[PDB]
Amino acid sequence: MELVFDKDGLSAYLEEVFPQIQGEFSIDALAKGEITMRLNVQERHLRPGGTVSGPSMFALADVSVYALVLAHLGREALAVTTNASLDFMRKPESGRDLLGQARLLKLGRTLAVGDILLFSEGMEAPVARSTMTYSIPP
Amino acid sequence: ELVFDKDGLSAYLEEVFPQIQGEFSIDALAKGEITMRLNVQERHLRPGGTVSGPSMFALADVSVYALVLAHLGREALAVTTNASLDFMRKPESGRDLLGQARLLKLGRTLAVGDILLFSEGMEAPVARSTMTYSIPP
Amino acid sequence: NLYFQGMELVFDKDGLSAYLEEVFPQIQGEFSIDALAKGEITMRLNVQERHLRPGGTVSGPSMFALADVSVYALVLAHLGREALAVTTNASLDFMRKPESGRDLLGQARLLKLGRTLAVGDILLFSEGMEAPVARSTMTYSIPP
Amino acid sequence: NLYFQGMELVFDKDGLSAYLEEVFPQIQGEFSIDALAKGEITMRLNVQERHLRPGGTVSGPSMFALADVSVYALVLAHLGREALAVTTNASLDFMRKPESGRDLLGQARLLKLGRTLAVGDILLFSEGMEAPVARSTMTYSIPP
């Protein structure tokens, strides 16, 4: 499993793939089995003293592992979320970006599985973890 | 025993979630079951669009959270600790999503509920989910 | 009460009981089918076969075992002999301590039976106690 | 070197082994601790103790067994004797078949040790095989 995409290309293709969510998600780092996606909490426009929601944390987890699955499979690969689990461990720090450190554990003929830790930037103890499973059609 | 009624609960959710807005409404509330609707008009999706994974997540979470509040009242500050979602079928574009949630445990410190998500009109569920929340003192 | 595509059984209860003891000789004595319907199965774990000390209760691995055998059996009830469902995911929530000295019942339902993936869920009960001790979701890969 | 609040161990490796064999007499011969650190444990499942048939591999409930005793052992390593961690949720993803005739290793890490809840995750390998056979998350309730 070597990448068929670089950080810049994949960021471009993601904006093409899902243009609805423009300026919410950005790649900090990309590597053969690892990605760090960033959720820009300025885009959320929460009231002061507010924190990223459960759904936005889901979104971050889902986009990170999906980006990584695409990273290897390419533009053709039509991968689909089949399962998602999320454990919510610590309240995120208000006003801080959320970072998703995602690794790919399986990329098989029919099924990919990645997991992910989520951090409020600056805080080293993770706010959440998640596993995401996808199916890969023909 | 429930401490909220459908409108009491619907009201308290608008209060607590003004972000929710016109997104979620309660079709039915009973002692251990709730049917919550995700009003897909409020999504303002492209034609041929379907409720996203995060939105299904949100429906599952609010449904079980509502049912927890339905029994515990304002007092309980219940917090989501675990969520899982299985995505089984593609929702039918243009329909509301319905969430049939049942509370399986309402403990001193932990609540568990699961949920079947349906595209309105389609009988086979599109997703299912379990949600666990911890209850402070 | 629930609809899914692929509801038809190709086994009856006794033919399924027989096929499970064939494919799994270890299950004979521990797991038996109480009921089988198009959407649903009730499987029994015979608590005596576990030879637990008095006051002792069924383990998490054993509950896992019950939850997984139940949904697997329902998938096979629909797909037949030449179908090789492989477990890909399992989740389990433990809600109450099983009642010591009683069989454990798993009431599974099949929520999906697709081309490549089968999904089902299950509530575990100490027989005769109405509050479920546990709940689970099992998912299986169906290959060619 | 992942960070979490409450990293200090109150047991050392041999000490924790003693305590686990004491509190789980059935575990003796099956599970052993290869390594303990503040944030991680390696537990071994002794494949010989399963007396598996030819070319047969470790069952899912045994893999659940390893994942639960690994994370539970690591939580005990921090909270000590007087603490009663009680499993509340478990998830497992099965990714590859184990290698037949090799022990199974669970490399667990602790992600949270709170007032009421503890969370850890684990990767399962056939020993000497780089690709992990299974991943799991375990959550435990801590009473007062």
TrEMBL record, chain B:
Quote the protein name from its UniProt record: Phenylacetic acid degradation-related protein
From TrEMBL, chains C, D:
Q: Which domain of life is it from?
A: Bacteria
Mind telling me what this protein is named?
A: Phenylacetic acid degradation-related protein
- Organism of derivation: Ruegeria sp. (strain TM1040) (Silicibacter sp.)
